Amino acid sequence: GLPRVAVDLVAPPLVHPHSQVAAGAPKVVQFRMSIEEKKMVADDDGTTAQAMTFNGSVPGPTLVVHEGDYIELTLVNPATNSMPHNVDFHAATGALGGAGLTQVVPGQEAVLRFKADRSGTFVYHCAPAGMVPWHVVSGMNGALMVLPRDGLRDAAGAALAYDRVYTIGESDLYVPKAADGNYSDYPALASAYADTVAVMRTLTPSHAVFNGAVGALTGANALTAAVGESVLIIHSQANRDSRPHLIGGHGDWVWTTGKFANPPQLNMETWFIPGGSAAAALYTFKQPGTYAYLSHNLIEAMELGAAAQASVEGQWDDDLMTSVAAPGPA
Ligand SMILES: [Cu+2]
Ligand SMILES: [Cu+2]
């Protein structure tokens, strides 16, 4: 040289713691882680896944820181576981972131560282190579954151714150288934892876868720818171896207993317885220119750898952518302 520281861690959702613102210164821271893977479951048924894551968871844791510172871481892976991992982151720169370096494987571880710177929230995440895615888716991753320183614121410136936171894451896833358908388962892882891837491719897823598962957150777991317060948430895723958212518520513020620187825106519703990344947112618450957271789409958330838741518490018122018446027628 510166110172360283360481831281711790925791888981888711938651975161851891821381513161925101511161013163312180830167430184470194540391852381560690571980891764784981595982397986688981896712848802418830059971378913588961495996896953992966870182620690464990888903898602892863886250871381935171611131811106510147650186861271460291370480891573581881273980052994046990297986695978490897690583881571991437987001954030840172280079390588990628770281991744390469880281790677680781298983056992181983490583560480780384870176620175942171930137711121816111962113895522881481795995991867490884091939694977990455697977990972891332598974788971993983877461876120871271850163824141610134010162713280936151618105647109214107013113310131713102928251319290718381938471975270968530888412895742997505894927697973596967067977033939018958258923778914497947496985154990281992690887076986698973292959287937896853295938578924993734386708894309778608398965588932988504947130954290892881478904438920987771828721118840217990778921988350928481218260018414018033514020818261923151963150878321894441890675891958894817888513968106877220928451428911018731718204956112317030935112951122978305996340870163822171720117512105935121316011218210828203838802947112977104993217895937990868994360974111964141814131818221617160018112018323119470529960718530838821978631995404919205628803378906995815518811268906797948994503878502968741947261718771718251417280018181119521019535016025616002019522019823017146119631229804128825016577
Ligand atoms: Cu991994
Ligand atoms: Cu990435």
Swiss-Prot record:
Q: Which segments constitute the Plastocyanin-like domain?
A: 1-165, 166-329
Listed binding positions for Cu cation 1 are 85, 126, 135, 140
Subcellular location(s) of the protein = Periplasm
Gene Ontology MF, one = copper ion binding
Q: Could you name the domain of life of the organism this protein comes from?
A: Bacteria
User: Which Gene Ontology biological process is one annotated for this entry?
Assistant: nitrate assimilation
- InterPro entries reported for this sequence: Cu-oxidase-like_N, Cu-oxidase_2nd, Cu-oxidase_fam, Cupredoxin, NO2-reductase_Cu
- Keywords for the protein's UniProt record, in alphabetical order: Copper, FAD, Flavoprotein, Metal-binding, Nitrate assimilation, Oxidoreductase, Periplasm, Repeat
* Residues that hold Cu cation 2 according to the record: 90, 125, 296
Q: Which SUPFAM superfamilies match?
A: Cupredoxins
Q: What does the note accompanying the cofactor annotation read?
A: Binds 1 Cu(2+) ion. The Cu(2+) ion is held by residues from each of 2 monomers of the trimer. Nitrite is bound to the Cu(2+) ion site. Pseudoazurin is the physiological electron donor for the Cu-NIR in vitro. Binds 1 Cu(+) ion. The Cu(+) ion is bound within a single monomer.
Q: What is its EC number?
A: 1.7.2.1
| Cofactor(s) this protein cannot do without | Cu(2+); Cu(+); FAD
Name the catalysed reactions: nitric oxide + Fe(III)-[cytochrome c] + H2O = Fe(II)-[cytochrome c] + nitrite + 2 H(+)
One Pfam family it belongs to: Cu-oxidase_3
Q: In which pathway does it act?
A: Nitrogen metabolism; nitrate reduction (denitrification); dinitrogen from nitrate: step 2/4
Is Transcription one of the keywords UniProt gives this record? no
Q: How does it assemble?
A: Homotrimer.
The domain section of the record reads:
The type I copper site in NIR plays a crucial role for electron transfer from pseudoazurin to the type II copper site of NIR, which comprises the catalytic center of NIR for the reduction of nitrite.
Family as reported in the entry's similarity comment: Belongs to the multicopper oxidase family.
State the protein's name. Answer: Copper-containing nitrite reductase
Annotated organism of origin: Alcaligenes xylosoxydans xylosoxydans
Which classification does the entry list for the species? Answer: Bacteria, Pseudomonadati, Pseudomonadota, Betaproteobacteria, Burkholderiales
